[PDB]
Design a protein around this motif. Structure first.
Motif, PDB file in Angstrom:
ATOM      1  N   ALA A  23      -6.156   4.081  12.053  1.00 48.54           N
ATOM      2  CA  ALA A  23      -6.932   5.158  11.450  1.00 48.54           C
ATOM      3  C   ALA A  23      -6.130   6.506  11.375  1.00 48.54           C
ATOM      4  O   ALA A  23      -6.116   7.197  10.340  1.00 48.54           O
ATOM      5  CB  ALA A  23      -8.274   5.357  12.237  1.00 48.54           C
ATOM      6  N   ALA A  24      -5.403   6.832  12.443  1.00 49.68           N
ATOM      7  CA  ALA A  24      -4.511   8.006  12.434  1.00 49.68           C
ATOM      8  C   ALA A  24      -3.455   7.918  11.339  1.00 49.68           C
ATOM      9  O   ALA A  24      -3.236   8.877  10.597  1.00 49.68           O
ATOM     10  CB  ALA A  24      -3.819   8.168  13.786  1.00 49.68           C
ATOM     11  N   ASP A  25      -2.798   6.775  11.220  1.00 45.09           N
ATOM     12  CA  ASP A  25      -1.752   6.635  10.188  1.00 45.09           C
ATOM     13  C   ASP A  25      -2.361   6.705   8.782  1.00 45.09           C
ATOM     14  O   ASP A  25      -1.737   7.201   7.905  1.00 45.09           O
ATOM     15  CB  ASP A  25      -1.032   5.308  10.312  1.00 45.09           C
ATOM     16  CG  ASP A  25      -0.152   5.216  11.556  1.00 45.09           C
ATOM     17  OD1 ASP A  25       0.098   6.255  12.209  1.00 45.09           O
ATOM     18  OD2 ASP A  25       0.267   4.080  11.864  1.00 45.09           O
ATOM     19  N   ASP A  28      -3.227  10.359   7.954  1.00 44.93           N
ATOM     20  CA  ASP A  28      -1.983  11.075   7.533  1.00 44.93           C
ATOM     21  C   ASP A  28      -1.487  10.644   6.126  1.00 44.93           C
ATOM     22  O   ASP A  28      -1.148  11.478   5.318  1.00 44.93           O
ATOM     23  CB  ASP A  28      -0.859  10.884   8.556  1.00 44.93           C
ATOM     24  CG  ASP A  28      -1.146  11.600   9.899  1.00 44.93           C
ATOM     25  OD1 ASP A  28      -1.985  12.564   9.925  1.00 44.93           O
ATOM     26  OD2 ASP A  28      -0.518  11.216  10.932  1.00 44.93           O
ATOM     27  N   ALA A  29      -1.497   9.338   5.851  1.00 42.11           N
ATOM     28  CA  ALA A  29      -1.029   8.816   4.584  1.00 42.11           C
ATOM     29  C   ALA A  29      -1.858   9.331   3.422  1.00 42.11           C
ATOM     30  O   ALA A  29      -1.336   9.557   2.333  1.00 42.11           O
ATOM     31  CB  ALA A  29      -1.025   7.320   4.580  1.00 42.11           C
ATOM     32  N   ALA A  30      -3.159   9.509   3.647  1.00 44.15           N
ATOM     33  CA  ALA A  30      -4.068   9.959   2.609  1.00 44.15           C
ATOM     34  C   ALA A  30      -4.098  11.489   2.461  1.00 44.15           C
ATOM     35  O   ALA A  30      -4.802  12.029   1.610  1.00 44.15           O
ATOM     36  CB  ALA A  30      -5.476   9.414   2.902  1.00 44.15           C
ATOM     37  N   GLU A  31      -3.316  12.177   3.278  1.00 43.18           N
ATOM     38  CA  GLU A  31      -3.407  13.614   3.427  1.00 43.18           C
ATOM     39  C   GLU A  31      -4.866  14.040   3.728  1.00 43.18           C
ATOM     40  O   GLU A  31      -5.304  15.097   3.328  1.00 43.18           O
ATOM     41  CB  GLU A  31      -2.829  14.307   2.192  1.00 43.18           C
ATOM     42  CG  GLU A  31      -1.372  13.972   1.994  1.00 43.18           C
ATOM     43  CD  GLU A  31      -0.664  14.799   0.912  1.00 43.18           C
ATOM     44  OE1 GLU A  31      -1.317  15.494   0.105  1.00 43.18           O
ATOM     45  OE2 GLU A  31       0.584  14.722   0.859  1.00 43.18           O
ATOM     46  N   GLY A  32      -5.606  13.205   4.455  1.00 44.47           N
ATOM     47  CA  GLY A  32      -7.002  13.581   4.835  1.00 44.47           C
ATOM     48  C   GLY A  32      -8.068  13.312   3.772  1.00 44.47           C
ATOM     49  O   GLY A  32      -9.258  13.519   4.036  1.00 44.47           O
ATOM     50  N   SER A 219      -7.012  -6.139  -0.195  1.00 43.37           N
ATOM     51  CA  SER A 219      -5.780  -6.109  -0.964  1.00 43.37           C
ATOM     52  C   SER A 219      -4.715  -5.243  -0.281  1.00 43.37           C
ATOM     53  O   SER A 219      -3.517  -5.373  -0.564  1.00 43.37           O
ATOM     54  CB  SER A 219      -6.095  -5.630  -2.402  1.00 43.37           C
ATOM     55  OG  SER A 219      -6.554  -4.287  -2.402  1.00 43.37           O
ATOM     56  N   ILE A 220      -5.124  -4.369   0.626  1.00 43.95           N
ATOM     57  CA  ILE A 220      -4.183  -3.468   1.283  1.00 43.95           C
ATOM     58  C   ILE A 220      -4.178  -3.669   2.799  1.00 43.95           C
ATOM     59  O   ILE A 220      -3.703  -2.846   3.560  1.00 43.95           O
ATOM     60  CB  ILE A 220      -4.455  -2.011   0.899  1.00 43.95           C
ATOM     61  CG1 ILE A 220      -5.833  -1.500   1.367  1.00 43.95           C
ATOM     62  CG2 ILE A 220      -4.387  -1.898  -0.639  1.00 43.95           C
ATOM     63  CD1 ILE A 220      -6.019   0.061   1.271  1.00 43.95           C
ATOM     64  N   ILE A 221      -4.704  -4.785   3.231  1.00 44.94           N
ATOM     65  CA  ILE A 221      -4.794  -5.065   4.667  1.00 44.94           C
ATOM     66  C   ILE A 221      -3.771  -6.171   5.025  1.00 44.94           C
ATOM     67  O   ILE A 221      -3.738  -7.214   4.405  1.00 44.94           O
ATOM     68  CB  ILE A 221      -6.177  -5.539   5.076  1.00 44.94           C
ATOM     69  CG1 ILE A 221      -7.223  -4.403   4.963  1.00 44.94           C
ATOM     70  CG2 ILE A 221      -6.170  -6.103   6.536  1.00 44.94           C
ATOM     71  CD1 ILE A 221      -8.716  -4.945   4.948  1.00 44.94           C
ATOM     72  N   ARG A 229      -2.385  -1.067   5.313  1.00 52.38           N
ATOM     73  CA  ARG A 229      -0.987  -0.566   5.204  1.00 52.38           C
ATOM     74  C   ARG A 229      -0.981   0.905   4.833  1.00 52.38           C
ATOM     75  O   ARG A 229      -1.454   1.273   3.747  1.00 52.38           O
ATOM     76  CB  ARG A 229      -0.249  -1.328   4.126  1.00 52.38           C
ATOM     77  CG  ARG A 229      -0.431  -2.769   4.177  1.00 52.38           C
ATOM     78  CD  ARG A 229       0.485  -3.422   3.187  1.00 52.38           C
ATOM     79  NE  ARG A 229       0.278  -4.833   3.376  1.00 52.38           N
ATOM     80  CZ  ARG A 229      -0.473  -5.616   2.618  1.00 52.38           C
ATOM     81  NH1 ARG A 229      -1.064  -5.166   1.517  1.00 52.38           N
ATOM     82  NH2 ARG A 229      -0.571  -6.890   2.953  1.00 52.38           N
ATOM     83  N   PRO A 230      -0.473   1.754   5.712  1.00 50.99           N
ATOM     84  CA  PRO A 230      -0.427   3.152   5.335  1.00 50.99           C
ATOM     85  C   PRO A 230       0.361   3.411   4.082  1.00 50.99           C
ATOM     86  O   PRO A 230      -0.028   4.302   3.311  1.00 50.99           O
ATOM     87  CB  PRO A 230       0.206   3.861   6.559  1.00 50.99           C
ATOM     88  CG  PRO A 230      -0.061   2.905   7.702  1.00 50.99           C
ATOM     89  CD  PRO A 230       0.112   1.536   7.051  1.00 50.99           C
ATOM     90  N   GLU A 231       1.452   2.671   3.850  1.00 47.45           N
ATOM     91  CA  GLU A 231       2.242   2.903   2.614  1.00 47.45           C
ATOM     92  C   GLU A 231       1.356   2.662   1.379  1.00 47.45           C
ATOM     93  O   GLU A 231       1.507   3.354   0.382  1.00 47.45           O
ATOM     94  CB  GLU A 231       3.538   2.086   2.582  1.00 47.45           C
ATOM     95  CG  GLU A 231       3.381   0.561   2.501  1.00 47.45           C
ATOM     96  CD  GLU A 231       3.187  -0.142   3.869  1.00 47.45           C
ATOM     97  OE1 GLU A 231       3.315  -1.385   3.898  1.00 47.45           O
ATOM     98  OE2 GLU A 231       2.876   0.514   4.895  1.00 47.45           O
ATOM     99  N   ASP A 232       0.426   1.711   1.445  1.00 53.29           N
ATOM    100  CA  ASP A 232      -0.513   1.448   0.303  1.00 53.29           C
ATOM    101  C   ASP A 232      -1.540   2.571   0.152  1.00 53.29           C
ATOM    102  O   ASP A 232      -1.968   2.854  -0.966  1.00 53.29           O
ATOM    103  CB  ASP A 232      -1.289   0.120   0.430  1.00 53.29           C
ATOM    104  CG  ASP A 232      -0.401  -1.136   0.235  1.00 53.29           C
ATOM    105  OD1 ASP A 232       0.808  -1.008  -0.125  1.00 53.29           O
ATOM    106  OD2 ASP A 232      -0.931  -2.260   0.438  1.00 53.29           O
ATOM    107  N   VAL A 233      -1.953   3.190   1.250  1.00 51.55           N
ATOM    108  CA  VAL A 233      -2.854   4.362   1.177  1.00 51.55           C
ATOM    109  C   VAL A 233      -2.106   5.504   0.422  1.00 51.55           C
ATOM    110  O   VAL A 233      -2.673   6.119  -0.469  1.00 51.55           O
ATOM    111  CB  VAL A 233      -3.347   4.763   2.564  1.00 51.55           C
ATOM    112  CG1 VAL A 233      -4.126   6.096   2.549  1.00 51.55           C
ATOM    113  CG2 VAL A 233      -4.224   3.652   3.135  1.00 51.55           C
ATOM    114  N   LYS A 234      -0.810   5.665   0.693  1.00 48.75           N
ATOM    115  CA  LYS A 234      -0.027   6.714   0.051  1.00 48.75           C
ATOM    116  C   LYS A 234       0.078   6.454  -1.451  1.00 48.75           C
ATOM    117  O   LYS A 234      -0.038   7.396  -2.256  1.00 48.75           O
ATOM    118  CB  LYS A 234       1.353   6.887   0.683  1.00 48.75           C
ATOM    119  CG  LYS A 234       2.103   8.065   0.119  1.00 48.75           C
ATOM    120  CD  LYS A 234       3.496   8.269   0.702  1.00 48.75           C
ATOM    121  CE  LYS A 234       4.447   8.801  -0.388  1.00 48.75           C
ATOM    122  NZ  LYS A 234       5.603   9.500   0.206  1.00 48.75           N
TER     123      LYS A 234
END
Ligand code: MG
Ligand code: MG
Lengths: 245, 245
Positions: A23-25, A28-32, A219-221, A229-234
């Protein structure tokens, strides 16, 4: 901190967290600009759920979305009772649970969605999505009326599920236009991934929906870890920034 | 004291009271097997209605029914907020207000009814009876699923209105059957008078509905005083004893 952090006051991603650290990563990846889903069905009772979701809240500034889990309508009441203690930014409900959750939340800031479903007929939606009603003969009603009932019950947004695929795009475009016209929010859910995000979202944006909370789950898990995946959130953030100029 | 006093655990009358004194007389005349309706619309605000309703509760051992008034769905929230503080035996609600009233009541003992209406089609019922939804295209659904949704929403009973007395006989007979089969209660309402009471109750009784709350309003009200006639309440009670003998 009851107000979700919509990017440009327009879009807030909703994804599942595998762990507090995940959840923390994601945050951060989503910029909140995100809401982290934690599912009631992963807990044996309300008190355990409440205690754990507070840990998620602490690392995401309360950007937590309480969910049912595995689409199980029998979780509705537990979600309402957890939400009353958690006071999350977002609550998932089934059609028959919208009013309960709003009443127990005790304020109008928490987003309370309501599950309604495609029927194969443009402009008609299925609203019998509750514990017993999900197992009766379908309740199929005009999408305009479904939205008015959800508004009458203290709802904030339509959760439209299962999105399915190309076969329901016409049905989806009509639900989005009804949302825009009744000034209601929209939460597309089911089958969203990195390849179709832009297209689906453009439909809701072209319709003039004010605030949109897309749900992006499997699809992003990473199934090996259960983590998003934080990279997918970005990537989703990048695509969302692009969609909005 | 939150349990309605059903005659033979089967029928409790619901009639309006013109004054606190009328309510006392009505309660005596029905030997307690009654709920006395007090209407939210007859008061300027929640607190003013709550103070008055407490006086009716005193003379009736809390056999009070909080009503909307004039069939107005825009009284729904006020009924919920009033009932929260009054804790009556019976609450009248529109479909979209059932869950809210149950939640703010905070217990499962008060009877919360839900208004659904005839449509002209046996087995189909109109459920878009709330403040915004009443202005939208009708939501017409299977009676079985409407009962399932009412249960999902914490409701106790179907309020079937407007019945127009015996004009919707066949639709009503099918609602009673559905109530009996899903073990839900039924409140017939609209056009009931001393001459058709027996035939209407016999329909719900033959269907095997477990608990029936008939609403008898204008036909037993003295237009000179606005008081419900205690002698007509006694007539309905005696008719009820004869129906179940
Ligand atoms: Mg007795
Ligand atoms: Mg007559």
């Amino acid at each position: 901190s009851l107000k979700a952090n919509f990017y440009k006051n327009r879009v807030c991603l909703n994804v599942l967290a595998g762990s507090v650290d995940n959840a923390a990563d994601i945050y951060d990846a989503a910029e909140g600009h995100v809401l982290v889903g934690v599912l009631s069905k992963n807990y044996p009772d309300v008190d355990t759920a409440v205690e754990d979701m507070k840990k998620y809240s602490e690392v995401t500034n309360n950007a937590v979305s309480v969910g049912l889990g595995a689409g199980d309508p029998n979780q509705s009441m537990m979600v309402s009772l957890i939400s009353q203690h958690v006071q999350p930014q977002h609550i998932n409900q089934v059609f028959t649970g919208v009013a309960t959750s709003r009443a127990l939340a005790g304020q109008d800031k928490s987003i309370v969605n309501g599950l309604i479903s495609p029927t194969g007929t443009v402009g008609m939606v299925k609203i019998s999505t509750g514990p017993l009603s999900s197992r009766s003969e379908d309740a199929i009603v005009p999408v305009e009326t479904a939205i008015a009932m959800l508004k009458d019950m203290g709802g904030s947004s339509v959760k439209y599920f299962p999105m399915g695929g190309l076969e329901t795009r016409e049905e989806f475009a009509c639900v989005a236009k009804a949302c825009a016209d009744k000034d209601f929010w929209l939460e597309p859910t089911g089958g969203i991934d990195l390849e179709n995000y832009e297209e689906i979202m453009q439909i809701a944006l072209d319709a003039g929906v004010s605030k949109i909370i897309p749900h992006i789950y499997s699809s992003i898990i990473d199934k090996a870890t259960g983590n998003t995946r934080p990279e997918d959130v970005k990537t989703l953030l990048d695509m969302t920034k692009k969609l909005l100029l």
